Nucleic acid binder design. Sequence first.
RNA 1: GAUAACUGAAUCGAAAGACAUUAUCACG
RNA 2: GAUAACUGAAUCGAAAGACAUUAUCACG
Lengths: 22, 20, 21, 16, 234, 240, 223, 232
Amino acid sequence: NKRRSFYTASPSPVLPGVKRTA
Amino acid sequence: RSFYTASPLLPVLPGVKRTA
Amino acid sequence: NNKRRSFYTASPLLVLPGVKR
Amino acid sequence: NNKRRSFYTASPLPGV
Amino acid sequence: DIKVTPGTSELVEQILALLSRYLSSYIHVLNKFISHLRRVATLRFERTTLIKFVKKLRFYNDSVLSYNASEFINEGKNELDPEADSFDKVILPIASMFVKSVETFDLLNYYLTQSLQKEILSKTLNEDLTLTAESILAIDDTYNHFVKFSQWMIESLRIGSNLLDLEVVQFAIKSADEDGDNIFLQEILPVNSEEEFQTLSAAWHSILDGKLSALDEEFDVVATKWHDKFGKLK
Amino acid sequence: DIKVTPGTSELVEQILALLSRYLSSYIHVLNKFISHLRRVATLRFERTTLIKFVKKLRFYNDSVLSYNASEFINEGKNELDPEADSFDKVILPIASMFVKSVETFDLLNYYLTQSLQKEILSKTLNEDLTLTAESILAIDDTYNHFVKFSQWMIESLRIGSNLLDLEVVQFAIKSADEDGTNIGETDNIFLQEILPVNSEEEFQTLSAAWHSILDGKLSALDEEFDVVATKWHDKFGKLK
Amino acid sequence: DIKVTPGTSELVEQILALLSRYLSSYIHVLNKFISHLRRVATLRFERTTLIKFVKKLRFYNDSVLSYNASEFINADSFDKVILPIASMFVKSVETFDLLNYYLTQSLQKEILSKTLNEDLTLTAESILAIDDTYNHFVKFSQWMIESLRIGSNLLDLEVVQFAIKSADEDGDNIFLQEILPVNSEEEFQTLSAAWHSILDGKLSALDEEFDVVATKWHDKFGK
Amino acid sequence: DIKVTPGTSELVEQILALLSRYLSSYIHVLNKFISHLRRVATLRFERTTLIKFVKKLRFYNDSVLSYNASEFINEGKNELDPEADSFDKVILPIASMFVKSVETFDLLNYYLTQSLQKEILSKTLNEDLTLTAESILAIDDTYNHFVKFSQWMIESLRIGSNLLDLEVVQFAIKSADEDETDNIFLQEILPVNSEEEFQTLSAAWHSILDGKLSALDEEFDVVATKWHDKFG
RNA sequence: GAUAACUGAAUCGAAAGACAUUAUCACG
RNA sequence: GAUAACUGAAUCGAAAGACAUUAUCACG
Ligand SMILES: [Mg+2]
Ligand SMILES: [Mg+2]
Ligand SMILES: [Mg+2]
Ligand SMILES: [Mg+2]
């Protein structure tokens, strides 16, 4: 969570070809 | 922009004229 | 302690006219 | 001038 | 081996156009910001850092806009030819461009939305040239989706390797192994025809255009904020 | 010329009580701020600077509260007594204390309301422990009036010299000479003329009118220090 | 046309090892710098920027070190096999470009502005080395790509196109010199190993200079 | 009971000249430091704090230099009358100036030699911008002796009160209560009975303090040279 | 005096226009 | 691991109480 803030500065649609619960 | 006050923009006082 | 004394001087440190030990 | 070139370097062969 | 069609050329061009739109949104807002920053003496070197970044984005954009896809695709004749290109071979360098770009945006977004934001407040003692919270949200949302689209293209055609892995995707995976829903961890279904890739691609296209419009809208709001709070006269 | 009365002792004590109230307002709010600042690592040394200041104020306050005025005023016996003290001689060290205090407040206010305010924003990236604009206004308004009251005491009895001059008063004067603002009725409090006083009865009357005004300013100051202490509580002290 | 051999697997692994050495040199010196910077309050956010960069380099390094070349080679064209290696180089090189500007230019100026403390700056010689190594990895990258005629608009390096567009407008420079095509894999291998020798030479000079700066940072701050 | 002479005027002027020398040493070295600091972006507000202090010293210095002592000393219808001024009355505002100045130096020294020194290392890690240990020693040694001289003037003529007490002197005393002496502040001031005696002791103090201010100057010159060589 | 120079194409200006022949900063 | 120590009397806690046997911070 101090490591996770180097990958996004932010603290539910289907996306094509992405199986939803996985 | 002052060393003398942080409020630039600042009724009759005992023993004082209104005059310089 | 010496934090109280550090407000009065920056030193280890502590003959003179009008003065008698 | 050298301000354009300064974005590409901080400075003043085989198969070539 | 899934095979090329005459319609393949335009599918590539359409994918690359998204990338160009993503790059161009940043270049426009950054050009503005860089101009405003010229008037702030204490942000002189941060400004030069931004110029370096924007130049890189601009170059990727010229590269993408000058790429003639047809010049790199051997095409279908009707269907039979064993010297015509694999769809694999054709998507690979497109995907690879996306990866390079996405990793560049990662570096930039951290600088732009985190470090520099803090530095701006520290140095100037105000909010007049910070980004809006909503613009940061949009930036991250757009990034996330382009990362996921990039992963879809690569994993759907099973053309991935250690070298095409995105840092943020591996990080999410390694974090889930150590820890016991997250967009990056969801599974990519393989695709078997080009007709299927095309269909899913155009659905992605619609989603990503949606994200880029939201991004554009938020970049317009901040450019206005910068105008009202810093640029204009007093 | 002007001579002491038995009532002079209490007039001094009353003047000194204002100074003590001024000092004590600062000491209270600064004690709170210093406590809050203990929890901010990046403001560690600024905190020690404030402690150094607050200690100085506290010392001036103990000094003032312990001063027994009667022990330094030789009253007269039935009226005339050629050994009884001049009113001049008696007000002089009181005025002189005010000057020392006022110049201390000047140094502190600049640090507290300007430098440190900027530093707090630079270091913490928020407003949670800055002062309110209104508290700053009050600080400056109170300072201005204590400066003017100090000048009144000194110039009214003609007991001034180069050494009792207040920096802010001379600055206003030198600024008007150079600019040309000393012509006519000025709106600037520091440039307005002090009328001399001729009796102690007159000094007492004017003194008590000043007393009323200054108590008014110190209540406004206290009110604003209560608001900012609350602000510091709500925005920083209280965790979730 | 040109075809793989059983020896191709090791040629790829050897090329990738250079990239790993280049990445690792930076990661080591940056880890040290980031630690020293902990003690400078005014450089707190510049430090976090460097962490972001170093994480990226570290990731490229794990990626490269985990890549088993044989798992991706068969029969395959030599073209097809070099392409993703070249492509990794390009991604890395453009990352280094961004990082070098920050590290050697912006940040250097910022350090002096904020601290006036030249103990925190890089040495001139380390900067020279950085730029010399970059230039040669750029040129090696271009060689691999243009020699096998596998290039495109998308594999163009910013610095190479900038040099070219600058010569057109202006009317000797390493980036503008011509890449000769290669016709056999035996020829690529020969030239590759000659490049390998040169680049190892540059990386040792780089390591030497990173040692010197790290020593300075140790002596002038230390543990 | 203790009266002015025609020589009193010059004794005051001489005392004040020391204070001016003390103020001026600081003003000189601070002017230099404030200039060097102009090139360090992270010390921008500390710099403005120093300016505020140096302005205050500069004002005390102009005040002292422009004070004409004779304009405030009634020598009298020469050496006769109860109209002529008490020596008490004349020294009092001089002593009082010393006290104001000494308490200003106390505030400044803490900032300059302690807080700001730590802040400089925290922000820059650049010891080129710090004071030398020897300059700090000198600063504190000079302060101590001006504090003691100030106390001597006040207690020797028995003109002291709660309002002229120096914070550092009371602190020493309260610390000894809670705890013959080696501590300068606790040692006893002998009363003086003539002006001739005050004058004699005053000039001996004058010699000692000039000695401290030269050592101070010397150390301010060393640190200024360092600042010149390493930046300027 | 110092600082600020991506052919970048933005920025500032209602406009005319401005943009190193410029702009900003600086202890009364 | 690092950082924080005015006998100051505030601060935190509804309270009991807590307050270097503590608190805060961290690619760490
Ligand atoms: Mg920078
Ligand atoms: Mg400080
Ligand atoms: Mg400060
Ligand atoms: Mg930064």
